[PDB]
């Protein structure tokens, strides 16, 4: 049978997602203040110590 | 090939083909298409030797009790209705009192056919079909309908005296819950699994006693609708619950003298001090009247779909819905005779009347038996 | 007593301390004999300990346990068409599953719970016995005997208390017609108590329209025929009397549309009461207020049933919402195609009041999309405003992949085969891919076909079709009609409306021929070509590089991308020639698809499939015979071989084909069939008139896992192909097809089968009227 | 161009002439919103400028639009009912 | 495939067929581990391996089901940061995973359904474990994933710019700015709203957005 099954340890093949896309920010002018990130969009930024890529062991 | 496409259930038909007092027919005169595929309480009756017999296809006879020749004949095939045609279709048995053949129908009519010609000397409607044969006494025709209504129709001219709902079944089940008059009170069972004596002369409750289970949350008999109709020999009401569960209880209070809440009892008669009863195995068993003390039982009848055990020619007679009449020893369960006179299965009981044994199956309509 | 050690004799899901904690006397806690019995019940309160024998070694507890846990399997036997997982689910209703606490008490709870289920199956003669089969160290298999004898059947509904109609006409107007009075014929019956539940309101809605506001079903007594099979029912009803709708007095918030709401409820006072019309007229107001933006309109009719004149009086209580409910919309199920493809398939826009059917027409446009399996939405009210609803259009996308095949028995003969595959917009790319081709000795055909249907914003259907037919019809060599046809076909569609879309394209038809067939209609168009090629010989070559201009337009109002049921579609497509062509002609056609539902359940819809075509020269030429039209085979008149219906050419009295297969491939040639043979196959008419009259038909005996796109489809197929360029002295003693009085006829059923390789159609048709040179293939195999 | 046959596009979130007359400069946001609900556009940038702005495409030449801004102050009290048609 | 051995033999053959990579067989050990014998001392590590081996058999929602199993089995565990990653790591591959990428067909204009959910879990990582080995790559997920979630609803905001639904431009463009006023797509949706008011004769409100372009596009 040609139907098979094998895959080992890594984060997913988007290793672009180890790089955390350069977000071109938006500061509102005065008197023209707009709302902010809401919904899912909340990033507690902690690239403080932690593994990306293959180094992120999953088991 | 063609046989391999179907599916089955089980019965054990005709053990002990017996002819020790070799049964024959008294006559055979078949009425027509009789007792049918409905829940039916129509059964043959034999009166005056003028055999007032009926089918469900309209036709009501008076056969003659030697050969079954028509003394009169009519048809209750009414020519109009909300089915566009109304046959007899009888939810009650043949009650012949006076010049009235009272029969309750699934046309909701309780007729009273004049026994000289068969013409309807009165008919009066009941609430839908009946659970009951017409019980004619006290100026009343006692019908307990499928709607649980103990009704009283004027047995001479037709007039509703009191239609009294007492014990409608739990899921509108069927089965006989016929109102029997005992000690002045109409004593009704009920395929709610209960029994009740009720003052017949207005429909006033003497007592209501739940005996045991009916269909609905305790799923029981649709192989054989158990008659909760009480055979009240004396002020111990003897009855069954709708799950077959036999009871003996007071007629004025419903206080239980004894009860078989083990009853698989299909048919049941009080034969002296020995309650002869057809169980769900279609065995005949003689329990006492002061207990379920088996005075005798039967293994010669087994999975037969029997009728009620009656007596004729010195033997316990019971036909079955395999159409085999049987003559059981009145003691311990042995056949003496066995008769297939049927072209059918005998749904109705062997009417041991006029010195004969009158029957009428669903299409095996009126034969009559001597041995 | 105070326990120094608790003896644990087998637990298997409850831990050692977790058993010990469920013991109210723990190791170190004092043992009481009441605590021992408390140790029994509270380890019985573990829900995993079948038996618990709490003893003690003086005080040192000896808790001998039997175990309920993991039921390692559950076996079913007698598990007939009522499925064993449903038999597991009433067992799951008995609290039992695989990997579970087995208390061995719930055995009959599985059984009588299933026997009560067996009652509500439709049977009553159906029993079940559960069997415990132990597996390693506590584990159990639950074997299950199922003793199912026979099922119950509804026989006849005795509706007593019926004083307006008869019972049987109700049963006729539930489902029935007559049975062979030398008139119509009907079917069979079985039991289910919900069919009883359904027809009683079909009883009531038969009363609710003919009057009868005080119609009421009084009671109901099912006959327990003592068989567990005979389901007669004694139903008490009461018609009450006929009733009239005697006036509408609509009130409440009619939202400033009061005449309109009255216009929907314009009734006849004294007209026999139609309560079914009344609730409809409520819905008339609801869509009226809905299309007026009020997405949540209360409409509450109230017939003040006036029994004194046997009438009713319609109070109506209407209350609309606010207009701008469509604040914004959402799109889900667009993980394979983008939002803006699905977003542009709508007529409801945000920043608007609600057009109630703008959601639906776009959903019908999404039904007319075809890249889907489902079309649904979530029109959710965002709370906070009466101008606030999110319409979350969640749909399910396309099932892709489709194949077509023909066989030439390759690798057991010459390497000969017919290919072809369709990708059905693979992965929702907006690239529908369908590619075919074939390599025989006769031909080596190449073809390409793909489009982005929306490649630019105005619906640019970027479709470039390619072809290279290295076709020779090789018998041994280039002797019988070589044609190396090659080139391209780039075509574009543009929407002129929301249901109207145009088409235009161009064709490059570069053909390379040799030794063409020695026959009239071949040479006759080539006589119109300005050639006069050899009648009596296949020695004649042809190079045409035709520069053709294609065009078209479509109508599209017809439901579904892969199982439509109602509407109409017109599909114009034609072609013409331009300068630079090697031949000057046109060829115009049209396709139609109009669905007329006879059944309003749309299991029986008229599906008329007919084909038209005409083409001739643009002056001084002809339309080619290879562009002349045909029919037969898989065509709209099936039951035939391919190219049967049409004009029939005549071979000139012919010699070798520059090589004649000896008494083979007969073209009036030198070896056999000589002296003006007639080309018996349909060589083609430059005009066409053919039709196929198909129907939706449900499959009432098929598992409907796949019948959502399976259509059994009967037909009566008929038509003609005929050449207005046909000669009649060349075809004097031969088939003349200058007239469309060549109406063939066939009839039969098409069997459309939804595979994972798409719909697969198959036909059987017996042609009972044919014309000249028709051939018959009743066993018709199609894709 | 010269197109004659086209799809046509509406866009509501309007205010009727009844809707303008229910409200007034000085009325609160809420007393507006009790009769009109919310607009489907406001000003997050700046004050409460409630935009009930109708649009419609009726064909090749010309356009249909009712742009109405309800400018409420920081207290949400109405300060402008700016009726503005197409163009 | 599923053995009925003692579980540590099943666990021995489990950790074999994981490191053998026999995920057709490894899961059937780990399932026979925790389902038949739900008393494994490694049943956290089995369910750790189950989220692993399901994902290692590319059983993404079953990894998510084993995640919710591990949420239910070990909500007291140092590898819920694993779970919070493998939650979103499922929801990365749950969202857009088609073979259409090599030929130049976008999947970010396609729905970020579980890319929303991956953003939740990779935030629920960097919320619930803001310290872990998994928290950095989840932070590497989020700032990248906000830009993937930018390009979907930007294509929605451009759609009402196509539609002429200019109120629905602003409801989408500020809807983007209510969602991600830090992505480059929000700087570039900002002229569409600036167009949108300008087509609706709110040129002054449009030129307000032009000064918003003068700030927010910087």
Provide the CATH number for the domain around residue C738. 2.40.160.50
CA distance B146 to chain C (A): 7
C107, C122, C150 — which closes off a domain? Answer: C150
Residues C146 and C156 in one domain: no
In a domain, C130, yes or no: yes
Q: Which residues of chain D approach chain A closer than 8 Å at the C-beta?
A: 44-46
Q: CA-to-CA distance for A21 and E145, rounded, in angstroms?
A: 8
Interface A-D, measured as beta-carbon pairs within 8 A, has a size of: 10
Task: Tell me if chain A has a CB within 8 Å of the CB of E180.
Answer: yes
- Token pair 């919320």 is found at E127
CB-nearest partner of E200 from D45, D57, D67: D67
Phi-psi region of C556 (alpha: psi -120 to 50; beta: other; left: phi over 0): beta
Report chain B residues whose CB lies below 8 A from the CB of C81. none
Yes or no: say if E211 and A34 are a contact pair by the CB < 8 Å rule. Answer: no
The alpha carbon of residue C261 and the mean position of all alpha carbons in its chain are separated, in whole angstroms, by 38
Per-residue tokens: C435: 């590619």
Are D45 and A35 within 8 A, CB to CB? no
> Can you state the angle between helices E80-93 and E60-73, rounded to 10 degrees?
160
Q: Is residue C98, in this structure, part of any structural domain at all? A: yes
Name which of E4, E38, E152 is nearest C136 (Cβ-Cβ): E4
Residue C283 has phi, psi (to 5 degrees) of -70, -25
Alpha-carbon gap, residue C202 to C649, rounded angstroms: 63
Structural domain including C366 reads 326-397
**Conformation bin of residue C51: beta by default, left when phi > 0, alpha when psi is -120 to 50:** beta
> Between chains, do C427 and E110 touch, taking CB under 8 Å as contact?
no
- Look at chain B and report how many structural domains it folds into: 1
- Whether C440 maps to a domain, the answer reads no
* β-strand partners of B63: B51
Residue with tokens 């607009």: D39
Cβ contacts of residue C527 below 8 Å, gap of 6+?
Answer: none
Please name every residue paired with B27 in a beta bridge, in sequence order, or none if there are none. B368
Structure tokens at B86: 């109304």
Closest in E116, E126, E148 to A44, CB measured:
E126
| The length of chain D, given as a count of residues | 87
Residue D60, classified by CB atoms within 10 Å of its CB into exposed (0-12), middle (13-18) or buried (19+), is: exposed
Chain C contact set for D9 (CB, 8 A): 349
> Reading across the β-sheet that carries C51-57, which strands appear in turn?
C7-9, C60-66, C51-57
How far, in Å, CA of B195 to CA of B237, rounded? 9
Q: How, if at all, do strands C71-74 and C140-145 pair?
A: parallel
| E63, E48 contact by CB (below 8 A) | no
Shared domain check, C294 and C181:
no
From A47's Cα to the closest Cα of chain E, the distance in A is 4
Is D86 at the interface with chain E, CB within 8 A? yes
Residue C313, helix vs strand vs coil: strand
Q: Which of C372, C397, C422 is the last residue of a domain?
A: C397
Nearest chain D alpha carbon to E164: D9
Tokens of B81: 């209705």
C251 and C361 inside one domain:
no
Q: Mutate which of A15, A18, A33, A59 to disrupt the E interface (most E C-beta within 10 Å)?
A: A59
User: Are residues C500 and D40, on separate chains, in Cβ contact within 8 Å?
Assistant: no
For residue C635, the SS3 value is coil
Q: What region does E157 belong to: left with phi over 0, alpha with psi -120 to 50, or beta? A: alpha
Contacts of C500 in chain D (CB under 8 A): 5
Of the candidates E111, E107, E132, which has an alpha carbon nearest to the alpha carbon of residue E121? Answer: E132
Nearest to A25 among E58, E145, E182 (CB): E182
Residue C405 lies in a domain: no
Chains that touch D (3 or more CB pairs under 8 A): A, C, E
E172:C135 CB<8 A: no
Contact between chains at C337 and E110 (C-beta distance less than 8 A): yes
Mapped onto helix, strand or coil, the DSSP state of residue E63 is helix
Say yes or no: C701 and C755 in one domain: yes
- Nearest-CA residue of chain E relative to C336? E110
Structurally, how many domains does chain D consist of?
Answer: 1
How many domains are contained in chain C?
6
Q: Please give the residue range of the domain that contains residue B158.
A: 1-371
CB-closest option in D44, D46, D87 to E201: D87
Per the CB < 8 Å rule, is E137 touching A41? no
Would you mind telling me the total number of residues written for chain E in this entry? 218
| D19 assigned to some structural domain | yes
Reported as type and span, the H/E element at residue C748 is: strand C744-755
Kind plus residue range of the DSSP H or E element containing B72: strand B72-75
Strands C230-238 and C153-160: parallel
**Preferred mutation among E122, E139, E190, E197 to probe A, highest tally of A CBs within 10 A:** E139
- What contacts C48, CB < 8 A, 6 or more positions away? C11, C12, C13, C14, C67, C68, C69, C101
The residues with which C492 forms a beta bridge, in sequence order, are C504
Looking at the fold, whether C715 and C754 belong to one and the same domain comes out as yes
**What is the spatial distance between Cα D61 and Cα E161, in angstroms, rounded to a whole number?**
20
Resolution of this model in Å is 10.8
- Read off φ and ψ for residue E16, nearest 5 degrees: -60, -65
- Beta-carbon contacts of C703 under 8 Å, excluding residues fewer than 6 positions away, are none
Give yes or no for a contact between B94 and B101, defined as CB atoms under 8 angstroms apart.
yes
Residues C134-168: b if buried by 16+ CB within 10 A, e if exposed? eeeebbbbbebebbbbbbbbbbbbbbbbbebbbbb
Residues of chain E contacting C328 with CB distance shorter than 8 Å: 168, 171-172, 175
CA separation for the pair B49, B63 (Å, rounded): 8
Q: Is residue D1 part of a domain?
A: no
Q: Does a structural domain hold residue C17?
A: yes
Q: Which residues make Cβ contacts (< 8 Å) with residue C376, sequence separation at least 6?
A: C363, C393, C394, C395, C396
Pair (C51, C175) in one structural domain: no
Residues present in chain C in total: 783
Residues C137 and C195 in one domain: no
With CA atoms as reference, report the closest residue to B131 among B40, B203, B222.
B40
User: Is C256 within a domain?
Assistant: yes
Distance CA C135, CA C72 (A): 7
- Residue B348 near residue B359, CB atoms below 8 Å: yes
Q: At which of C358, C381, C397 does a domain end?
A: C397
3-class DSSP assignment, residue C149: strand
Which residues in chain C touch residue D18, judged by CB atoms under 8 angstroms apart? 256
Question: Max CA-CA distance within chain B?
Answer: 63
In a domain, D3, yes or no: no
> In Å, how far is B136's CA from the nearest CA of chain C?
24
- Choose among E196, E134, E132, E130: nearest CA to E159: E196
Q: Tell me which chain E residues have a C-beta less than 8 angstroms from the C-beta of D65.
A: 200-201
Which residues on chain D are in Cβ contact (under 8 Å) with E166? Answer: 11, 53, 55
Give the mutation candidate from D11, D17, D38 for the C interface (greatest C CB count, under 10 A): D38
- Which of E156, E176, E193 should we substitute to test contact with C (largest number of C Cβ atoms within 10 Å)? E156
Which member of D9, D13, D18 has the closest CB to residue C324?
Answer: D13
Interchain CB contact of D63 with C (< 8 Å): no
- Output the domain CATH number for residue D78: 3.30.1450
CA distance E21 to E29: 12
* Rounded Cα–Cα distance for residues C523 and C338 (Å): 54
Q: Distance of alpha carbon C611 from its chain centroid, rounded?
A: 24
CA distances from residue C566 to C591, C680, C700, C740 in whole angstroms, order as listed: 17, 41, 21, 31
| Chain C nearest CA to B365, separation (Å) | 19
Cβ neighbour number for residue C419 with a 10 Å cutoff: 15
* CATH code of the domain in which C51 resides: 3.10.20.310
What is the nearest CA distance from E122 to chain D, expressed in angstroms?
Answer: 30
Q: Is C383 on the interface with D (CB under 8 A)?
A: no
Q: Hey, is the C-beta of E98 within 8 angstroms of any chain C C-beta?
A: yes
Cα–Cα separations (whole angstroms), residue C440 to C473, C538, D11:
9, 21, 59
Residues C89 and C169 in one domain: no
Whether the Cβ atoms of residue D35 and residue D23 lie closer than 8 Å to each other: yes
Chain C nearest-CA distance from B355, in A, is 31
Q: Give the D:E interface size as CB pairs under 8 Å.
A: 45
Q: Which chain C residues are closer than 8 Å to B165 by Cβ? A: none
Degrees to nearest 5, angle at CA A31 with A25 and A35: 45
Residue C772 falls inside a structural domain: yes
In this structure, are C81 and C186 located in the same domain?
A: no
Find, in chain D, the residue whose alpha carbon is nearest to that of E200.
Answer: D67
**C293: Cα within 13 Å, side-chain hemisphere:** 24
Q: What are phi and psi of C768, to 5 degrees?
A: -105, -10
Q: Do C324 and D12 touch (CB under 8 A)?
A: yes
**Six token digits for residue B45:** 């009756």
Domain span including residue D21: 9-85
């Amino acid at each position: 049978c040609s139907s098979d099954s094998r895959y080992k340890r890594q984060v997913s093949g988007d290793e672009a997602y180890l790089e955390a896309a350069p977000l071109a920010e938006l500061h509102a002018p005065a008197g023209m203040i707009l709302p902010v990130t809401s919904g899912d969009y909340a990033i507690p930024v902690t690239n403080g110590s932690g593994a990306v890529g293959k180094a992120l062991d999953i088991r | 090939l063609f046989n391999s496409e179907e599916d089955v259930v089980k019965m054990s038909p005709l053990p002990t083909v017996e002819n020790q007092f070799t049964p024959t027919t008294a006559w055979s005169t078949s009425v027509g298409s009789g007792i049918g595929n409905f829940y039916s309480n129509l059964h043959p009756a034999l009166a005056d030797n003028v055999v007032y017999a009926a089918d469900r296809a309209g036709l009501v006879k008076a056969l003659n009790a030697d050969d079954g020749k028509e003394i009169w004949s009519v048809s209750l095939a009414e020519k109009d209705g909300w089915f566009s045609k109304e046959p007899a279709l009888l939810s009650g048995g043949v009650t012949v009192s006076g010049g009235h053949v009272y029969i309750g129908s699934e046309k909701a009519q309780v007729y009273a056919l004049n026994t000289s010609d068969g013409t309807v000397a009165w008919q009066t409607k009941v609430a839908g079909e009946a659970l009951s044969r017409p019980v004619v006494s006290d100026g009343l025709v006692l019908i307990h309908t499928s709607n649980g209504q103990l009704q009283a129709l004027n047995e001479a001219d037709g007039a509703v005296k009191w239609t009294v709902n007492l014990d409608m079944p739990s899921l509108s089940l069927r089965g006989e819950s016929a109102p029997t008059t005992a000690f002045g009170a109409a004593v009704v069972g009920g395929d709610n699994g209960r029994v009740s004596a009720v003052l017949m002369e207005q429909g006033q409750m003497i007592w209501q006693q739940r005996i045991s289970q009916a269909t609905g949350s305790t799923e029981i008999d649709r192989l054989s609708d158990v008659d909760t109709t009480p055979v009240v020999v004396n002020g111990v009401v003897f009855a069954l619950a709708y799950n077959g569960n036999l009871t003996a209880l007071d007629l004025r209070s419903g206080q239980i003298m004894w009860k078989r809440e083990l009853g698989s009892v299909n048919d049941f008669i009080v034969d002296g001090n020995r309650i002869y009863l057809v169980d769900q195995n279609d065995r005949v068993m003689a329990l006492t009247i002061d207990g379920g003390v088996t005075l005798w039982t039967q293994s010669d009848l087994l999975h037969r779909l029997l009728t009620s055990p009656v007596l004729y020619n010195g033997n316990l007679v019971v036909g079955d819905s395999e159409g085999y009449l049987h003559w059981i020893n009145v003691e311990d369960g042995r056949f003496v005779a066995q008769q297939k006179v049927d072209s059918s299965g005998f749904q109705t009981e062997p009417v041991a009347a006029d010195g004969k044994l009158l029957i009428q199956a669903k299409d095996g309509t009126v034969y009559s038996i001597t041995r | 007593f105070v326990v120094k050690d608790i003896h644990f004799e087998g637990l298997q899901r409850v831990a050692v301390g977790a058993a010990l904690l469920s013991m109210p006397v723990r190791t170190g806690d004092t043992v009481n004999d009441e605590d021992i019995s408390n140790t029994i019940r509270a380890l019985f309160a573990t829900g995993n300990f079948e038996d618990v024998r709490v003893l003690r070694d003086g005080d040192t507890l000896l808790v001998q346990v039997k175990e309920r846990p993991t039921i390692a399997s559950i076996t079913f036997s007698g598990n007939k068409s009522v499925k064993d997982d449903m038999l597991k689910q009433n067992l799951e209703a008995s609290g039992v599953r695989v990997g579970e606490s087995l208390d061995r008490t719930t055995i009959a709870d599985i059984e009588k719970g299933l026997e009560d289920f067996y009652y509500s199956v439709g049977k009553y003669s159906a029993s079940v016995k559960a069997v415990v089969t132990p597996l390693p160290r506590n584990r159990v298999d639950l074997k299950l005997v199922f003793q199912e004898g026979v099922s119950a059947e509804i026989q006849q509904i005795n509706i007593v208390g019926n004083h307006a109609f008869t019972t049987d006409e109700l049963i006729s107007h539930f489902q029935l017609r007559d049975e062979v009075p030398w008139w119509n014929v009907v079917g069979d019956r079985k039991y289910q108590k919900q069919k009883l539940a359904g027809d009683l309101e079909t009883l009531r809605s038969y009363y609710l329209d003919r009057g009868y506001a005080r119609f009421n079903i009084d009671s109901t007594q099912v006959s327990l025929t003592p068989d567990k099979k005979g389901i007669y029912v004694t139903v008490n009803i009461t018609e009450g009397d006929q009733y009239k709708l005697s006036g509408v007095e609509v009130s409440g918030n009619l939202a400033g549309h009061s005449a309109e709401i009255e216009q929907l409820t314009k009734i006849e006072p004294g007209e026999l009461y139609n309560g079914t019309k009344v609730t409809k007229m409520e819905d008339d107001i609801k869509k009226l207020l809905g299309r007026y933006g009020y997405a949540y309109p209360r409409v509450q009719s109230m017939p003040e049933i006036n029994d004194a004149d046997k009438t009713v009086k319609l109070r109506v209580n209407v209350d609309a919402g606010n207009r701008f409910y469509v604040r914004k919309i959402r799109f889900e199920g667009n993980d394979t195609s983008k939002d803006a493809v699905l977003r542009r398939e709508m007529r409801q826009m945000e920043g608007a009041w609600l057009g109630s059917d703008l959601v639906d027409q776009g959903k019908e446009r999404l039904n007319r999309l075809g890249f889907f399996e489902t079309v649904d939405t979530d029109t959710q009210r965002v709370p906070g405003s009466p101008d606030q609803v999110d319409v979350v259009y969640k749909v399910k996308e396309r099932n892709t992949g489709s194949f077509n095949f023909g066989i030439g028995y390759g690798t057991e003969s010459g390497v000969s085969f017919q290919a072809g595959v369709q990708q059905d917009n693979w992965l929702g790319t907006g690239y529908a891919v369908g590619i075919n081709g074939t390599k025989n000795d006769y031909q080596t055909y190449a073809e390409l076909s793909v489009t982005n249907p929306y490649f630019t914003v105005d619906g640019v259907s970027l479709g470039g079709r390619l072809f290279y037919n290295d076709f020779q019809a090789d018998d041994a060599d280039l002797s019988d009609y070589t044609n190396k046809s090659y080139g391209t076909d780039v075509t574009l569609g543009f929407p002129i409306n929301e249901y109207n879309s145009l088409r235009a394209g161009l064709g490059y038809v570069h053909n390379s021929l040799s030794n063409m067939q020695p026959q009239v209609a071949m040479w006759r168009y080539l006589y119109s070509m300005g050639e006069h090629p050899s009648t009596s010989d296949q020695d004649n070559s042809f190079k045409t590089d035709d520069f053709t201009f294609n065009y078209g337009w479509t109508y599209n109002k017809l439901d579904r991308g892969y199982f439509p049921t109602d509407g109409s579609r017109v599909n114009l497509t034609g072609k013409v020639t331009i300068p630079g062509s090697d031949n000057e002609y046109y060829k115009v056609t049209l396709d139609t698809a109009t669905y007329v539902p006879i059944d309003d359940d749309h299991k029986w819809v008229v599906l008329g499939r007919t084909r038209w075509g005409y083409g001739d020269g643009l002056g001084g030429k002809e339309m080619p015979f290879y562009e002349n039209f045909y029919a037969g085979g898989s065509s709209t008149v099936r039951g035939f071989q391919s190219n049967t219906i049409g004009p029939k050419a005549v071979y000139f009295p012919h010699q070798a084909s520059n090589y004649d297969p000896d008494y083979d491939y007969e073209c009036a040639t030198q070896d056999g069939a000589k002296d003006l043979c007639k080309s018996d196959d349909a060589v083609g008419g430059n005009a066409m008139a053919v039709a196929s009259l198909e129907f939706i038909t449900p499959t009432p005996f098929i598992s409907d896992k796949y019948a959502n796109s399976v259509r059994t489809s009967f037909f009566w197929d008929m038509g003609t192909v005929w050449d207005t360029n046909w000669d009649s002295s060349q075809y004097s003693g031969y088939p003349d097809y200058s007239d469309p009085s060549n109406i063939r006829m066939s009839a039969g059923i098409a069997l459309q089968w939804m595979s994972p390789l798409g719909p697969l159609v198959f036909s059987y048709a017996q042609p009972f009227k044919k014309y000249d040179g028709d051939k018959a293939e009743q066993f018709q195999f199609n894709i | 161009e010269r197109v004659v046959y086209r799809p046509d596009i509406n866009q509501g979130n309007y205010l009727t002439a009844n809707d303008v007359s229910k409200i007034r400069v000085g009325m609160t946001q809420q007393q507006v919103a009790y009769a009109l609900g919310t607009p489907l556009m406001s000003d997050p940038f700046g004050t409460n400028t409630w935009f009930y702005v109708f649009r419609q495409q009726p064909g090749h030449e010309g356009v249909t639009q009712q742009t109405l801004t309800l400018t409420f102050n920081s207290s949400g009290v109405l300060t402008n009912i700016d009726n503005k048609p197409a163009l | 495939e599923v053995p009925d051995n003692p579980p540590n033999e099943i666990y021995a053959t489990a950790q074999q067929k994981l490191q053998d990579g026999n995920w057709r067989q490894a899961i059937t050990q780990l399932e026979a581990l925790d389902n038949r014998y739900p008393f494994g001392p490694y049943s956290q590590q089995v369910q750790l391996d189950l989220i692993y081996a399901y994902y290692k058999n590319a059983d993404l929602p079953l990894a998510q089901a084993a995640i919710d199993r591990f949420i239910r089995l070990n909500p007291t565990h140092p590898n819920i940061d694993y779970v919070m990653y493998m939650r979103g790591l499922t929801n990365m591959a749950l969202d857009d995973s088609a073979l259409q990428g090599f030929f130049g067909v976008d999947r970010s204009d396609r729905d970020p359904q579980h890319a929303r959910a991956a953003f939740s879990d990779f935030s629920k990582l960097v919320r619930g474990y803001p310290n872990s080995q998994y928290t950095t790559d989840a932070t590497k997920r989020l700032v990248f994933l906000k830009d993937r979630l930018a390009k979907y609803e930007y294509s929605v905001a451009e759609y009402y710019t196509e539609r002429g639904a200019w109120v629905a431009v602003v409801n989408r463009v500020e809807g983007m700015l209510r969602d991600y006023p830090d992505t480059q797509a929000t700087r570039d949706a900002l002229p569409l709203m600036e167009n949108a008011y300008r087509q609706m004769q709110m040129n002054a409100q449009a030129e307000k957005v032009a000064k918003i372009i003068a700030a927010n596009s910087s």
